[PDB]
Ligand binder design. Sequence first.
Ligand SMILES: *[C@@H]1O[C@H](CO)[C@@H](O[C@@H]2O[C@H](CO)[C@@H](O)[C@H](O)[C@H]2NC(C)=O)[C@H](O)[C@H]1NC(C)=O
Ligand SMILES: *[C@@H]1O[C@H](CO)[C@@H](O[C@@H]2O[C@H](CO)[C@@H](O)[C@H](O)[C@H]2NC(C)=O)[C@H](O)[C@H]1NC(C)=O
Ligand SMILES: *[C@@H]1O[C@H](CO)[C@@H](O)[C@H](O)[C@H]1NC(C)=O
Ligand SMILES: *[C@@H]1O[C@H](CO)[C@@H](O)[C@H](O)[C@H]1NC(C)=O
Ligand SMILES: O=C(O)CCC(=O)C(=O)O
Ligand SMILES: O=C(O)CCC(=O)C(=O)O
Ligand SMILES: [Fe+2]
Ligand SMILES: [Fe+2]
Ligand SMILES: [Fe+2]
Ligand SMILES: [Fe+2]
Ligand SMILES: [Mn+2]
Ligand SMILES: [Mn+2]
Lengths: 686, 686
Amino acid sequence: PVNPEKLLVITVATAETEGYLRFLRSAEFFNYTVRTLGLGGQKVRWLKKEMEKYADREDMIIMFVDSYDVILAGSPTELLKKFVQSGSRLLFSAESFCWPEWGLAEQYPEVGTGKRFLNSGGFIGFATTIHQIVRQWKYKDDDDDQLFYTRLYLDPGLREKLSLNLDHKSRIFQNLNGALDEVVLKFDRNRVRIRNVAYDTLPIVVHGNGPTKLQLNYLGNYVPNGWTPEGGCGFCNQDRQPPPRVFLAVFVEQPTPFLPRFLQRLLLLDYPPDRVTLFLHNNEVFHEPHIADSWPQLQDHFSAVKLVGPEEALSPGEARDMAMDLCRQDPECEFYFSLDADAVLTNLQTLRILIEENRKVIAPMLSRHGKLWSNFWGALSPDEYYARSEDYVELVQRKRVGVWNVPYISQAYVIRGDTLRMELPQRDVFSGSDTDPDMAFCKSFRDKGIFLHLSNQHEFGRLLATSRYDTEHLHPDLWQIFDNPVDWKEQYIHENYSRALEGEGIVEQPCPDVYWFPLLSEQMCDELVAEMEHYGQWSGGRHEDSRLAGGYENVPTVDIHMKQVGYEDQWLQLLRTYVGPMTESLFPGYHTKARAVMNFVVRYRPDEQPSLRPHHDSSTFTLNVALNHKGLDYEGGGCRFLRYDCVISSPRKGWALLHPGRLTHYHEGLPTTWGTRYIMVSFVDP
Amino acid sequence: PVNPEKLLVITVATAETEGYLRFLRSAEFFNYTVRTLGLGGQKVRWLKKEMEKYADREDMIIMFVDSYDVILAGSPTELLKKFVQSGSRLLFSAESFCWPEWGLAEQYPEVGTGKRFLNSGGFIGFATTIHQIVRQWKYKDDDDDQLFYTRLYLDPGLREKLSLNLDHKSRIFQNLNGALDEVVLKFDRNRVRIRNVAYDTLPIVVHGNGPTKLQLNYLGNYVPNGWTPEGGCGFCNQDRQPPPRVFLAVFVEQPTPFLPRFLQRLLLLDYPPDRVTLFLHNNEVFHEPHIADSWPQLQDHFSAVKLVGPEEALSPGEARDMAMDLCRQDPECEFYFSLDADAVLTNLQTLRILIEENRKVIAPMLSRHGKLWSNFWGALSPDEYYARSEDYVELVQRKRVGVWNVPYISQAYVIRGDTLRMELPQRDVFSGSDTDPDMAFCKSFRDKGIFLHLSNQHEFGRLLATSRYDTEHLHPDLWQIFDNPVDWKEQYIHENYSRALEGEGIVEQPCPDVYWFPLLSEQMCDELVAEMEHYGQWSGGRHEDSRLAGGYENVPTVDIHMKQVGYEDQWLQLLRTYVGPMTESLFPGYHTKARAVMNFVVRYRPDEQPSLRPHHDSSTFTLNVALNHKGLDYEGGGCRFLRYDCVISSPRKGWALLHPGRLTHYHEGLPTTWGTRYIMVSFVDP
Ligand SMILES: *[C@@H]1O[C@H](CO)[C@@H](O[C@@H]2O[C@H](CO)[C@@H](O)[C@H](O)[C@H]2NC(C)=O)[C@H](O)[C@H]1NC(C)=O
Ligand SMILES: *[C@@H]1O[C@H](CO)[C@@H](O[C@@H]2O[C@H](CO)[C@@H](O)[C@H](O)[C@H]2NC(C)=O)[C@H](O)[C@H]1NC(C)=O
Ligand SMILES: *[C@@H]1O[C@H](CO)[C@@H](O)[C@H](O)[C@H]1NC(C)=O
Ligand SMILES: *[C@@H]1O[C@H](CO)[C@@H](O)[C@H](O)[C@H]1NC(C)=O
Ligand SMILES: O=C(O)CCC(=O)C(=O)O
Ligand SMILES: O=C(O)CCC(=O)C(=O)O
Ligand SMILES: [Fe+2]
Ligand SMILES: [Fe+2]
Ligand SMILES: [Fe+2]
Ligand SMILES: [Fe+2]
Ligand SMILES: [Mn+2]
Ligand SMILES: [Mn+2]
């Protein structure tokens, strides 16, 4: 049994990058002893000088491995046991490819189903045997170390004398390149390993050599104590006097729904505004009225503000370069926060949480509501298109939560200002090529060995759909009930609707079988009324309605139907989602799909039609929503139910009436004496 | 100016018949002096002997006229003025036909547009001139008086010497035969005359000679004081201790609706039953159960009773002969009352009123409800078929009321027993020929000069329709809603329905929008239930209904639809007539034609289906009629309206519930624990 205190791990690194520190944490997890060369071709020269101290130490086992692209998955005890089991005095890692000299592939011994060729990224042997190898180095730093070990190994006499071997079946070393299909994660309670399903082994050293850095990043999120079924993630903050100064950059590169809401939300972020500088690039002339309306509040709120409008003809890549460089060139910019207009931050502590994670680059996970689409990618295709990773759905669904090393992030991220100055000083981060600005940004950080972190440890927010947003309306957000229903409800559905639907005594019954509940917010009423007048073609003479009064005759109103303004599909959707469930609640036993042929807005004026004579409705039940204020906008009565001698004297603006349309509720519209009275009517289930 | 006290009217009559007395009343109306010969050919012999007393009375004007077929229409003053105007000493009446000797027509003077030939039924002249004519009679009673006067008149020398003339243009005498189209009634305030529109004259003497007795009967109902626009009829009773003994004869010669009702009505006639003998001839085996059920009550009610059933194979003519002869052969039968089963006597004083009119034969006017058809004819065709008289519609509509001399009566009449014994002693009154028994009866009385009187002075009753009465039912009267709606309502519609419909606080509201009103009588419920069980094919497994419960699913019942028993058309009629107007009253503003696809009788039993789970109705409103008694026939609850926490604990048998079918009135049928519970359901306006 070889003594673990006699095992020494040697690696080389010239800077404490995130990869090197990831390697050290995995080594410290298993209580390895690590000697790092070169911090304070050239690899062998450093190792050879290092080995002269251990030239006679037959009692020492030394494992040399890379650090930037290596994680440890097993204990020194298991490692020394497998080394003794190999019966070798210097065991090299094996791999699928023979390089740099492909011609030397013939000199290699036949291996069978295992890997045949040497890889100098990881080997383990006795100090004495290794010293006899590395002392034979008398070349220069530019020269190839892989060729040095390969030629020495291919020496048949030197191979048998020193007992050199290759770990053919990946018992100890696992090189990822050429063997991605062989490696799977093997989970335990508080530790994760890899398994080679080709040779049924549990390698100790995971080496992401060649073009497999992204696959190592993925494995490194678990191995050895990245994320565990019982302990969760092991490097995140988990459970959570001046805060750092932050440059907040907002980007509007396309017409975006609910932008006035996004701008107003900027005033609610729980981070001191005197410590935040706002940069806002708006590329859309359609959003110029929006930016202008809320700019006075933003200017008073934040420390400093700056707007770059559509007039400067800035492409998204140029605007993102400019905003990022403004932070880079300011020694007082400690953190850079890039937030796109289609990102809805439901968690107002997002900027704090991400800063406290203390990463170079970190994004809050944001997903399109009810779908898998989100602001990060788990994997890439060879030509850098989206590909779904093995754990992508688990992360989006938050089955596994933590801080994850991912190939792609977007729409919201926080970048350490020191990183922009020291490690990424160039201006062309998003620009400089024909590739997409968002992908050029991720590649720029990947090319410098900078991890892109993603946190789903909390609920941060969601992503608006902007794909096909019809801007040809007076209020386009009114037509967003399908694409962004969650945000459409927060803007247009009355705030106390859900409380009323859940009971809580909000629903009223002003007349016997007539119910009264809050439905539309004051903004929906104002925009719907405005949209009606913008059309302007109200009905008049020869207008016919589905009303029954004193026999087979019809009662008309000055009105506009939803079909005319192209809003029936949208209003029908509201009827299904909100009116329907309310009607089944208030009328136990009744079921409805909220069918409605007659949906229309009535206008009452003393100038034209001020009243509506007694009549019945061609409907099972009728929805009657007030659209403006009694007293402020109009005077005069509302609704009278003659058989019950009951009158809705004061209609509440956002609220709606629900009454039977036939037989029992002969109803009348009282004359409107001053101003203009607007209501929204639906004859449901005809 | 000739003195009216010098004018004497002479007529001949051997009995004081109704025609003779009619003539006398018209004569007494104008204060004529009438000498009747022959009371205590042969006509001339009596007149000739009479005239010998006045052979030298040049101061006397004598008018000889018939009496049985003559009515006077003018005053002696006007008569003497027109006689003086004629410039004649013996003026005969003129007519269109030359008889008995047609060959003598050539000897007559040419007359132009007037009548050319003599009629010996009426002449006026000086007593002296008449004596010189009548004294020339030396023949026998069998010989012809018309030929006697005609040959004397055609003597050219005697015609000029005595100044004989004919009333060519009907200035004084109007013979009806051959001039019916020339005669119209001329009305005044309190007197009616005739006018000859051919010659524009107002004749004094109306003579219904030849085959014109019926037309004289018609004229005689007005002239001179028969019926007047301001005085009304002048020989009727107008404004109304043992009563005379009466033989009441009832005839059932065809299947007749509501016969149990007719039989029970016999017990309510306001005439002492100890003075009435009942004869009942029933020809229908279908009515044998009816006669038997009510015979014990009839036997106890009347003085004596006698039934002649279908087993004696008696034709209607034979039965009517037998019943009439039973009265004729009994000196104690003072009046004979013949009442057919299709005659509904709404006036229980009918027998009194007709007896107090003091006529030989008199009928109460009875008409089919809402139609002109009635129990008398105003006119006849030459072959004795129905013809409409000039005043028929006025009499049926009771625009003119009185007691009218008519050619035909039926279905109800009162005959003086003395008339049957003295004036109509034969047995074959209705029988003895191939003519109809009802027409043979009228002809028999007409042939004896007996008037057939008809009284519309009061509202007496109506005539049931028996034309197509489908006897192939357990209760055929249930299907009489179309043919006899008035009588169908009295039997099957609840007695307090009309009072409830007119207000009076009978209608109740046991639950919020659920109304409760009396609809069906206890007899309708018992017969409808009995008719359902007689069919017996109640529904069971796979039975589907138009009920909505907890989604798109259907709730079944053990029931039978009206369509199955062939009663939908009849029940739909009841819905229109009675349910409809009630629904529009209780739901002001709602209009309905009472459409209903689902009409059915539900049966509840603990053995089978005792309850009905909560559900809605496929209807605007639902009619729910109880059909039996809670407690007596069944135990267990009725109807529960869940949204209102209201229960119809005790359903009233005849009553019905009216509630909305959709949205608001989720209702449930409580389990029936004992017995059998029947209800009638209609889903109106689906
Ligand atoms: C939703 O309900 C809340 C509470 O029931 C409403 O809040 C109140 O607003 C009125 C003024 O309109 C104040 O006088 C009360 O003091 C408030 N109550 C509370 C508890 O804050 C709120 O107005 C309702 N929403 C809308 C749109 O009216
Ligand atoms: C129709 O209404 C009358 C009066 O409202 C009902 O008559 C009463 O009958 C009950 C017995 O059922 C008696 O106790 C009362 O004294 C009666 N009142 C009068 C004023 O006579 C009659 O019952 C109703 N019709 C039906 C079929 O029930
Ligand atoms: C590593 O060593 C420390 C003491 O130096 C010990 O507490 C810990 O349990 C060790 N961990 C492992 C995995 O052996
Ligand atoms: C008939 O005579 C009586 C008196 O005898 C007289 O009262 C009556 O008015 C007369 N009627 C007519 C119509 O002359
Ligand atoms: O003005 C009202 O409140 C009555 C509305 C109504 O019944 C209708 O819109 O047809
Ligand atoms: O039994 C009752 O009264 C409920 C009747 C009902 O709702 C039905 O007949 O469908
Ligand atoms: Fe309309
Ligand atoms: Fe309406
Ligand atoms: Fe049924
Ligand atoms: Fe029902
Ligand atoms: Mn490497
Ligand atoms: Mn005569």
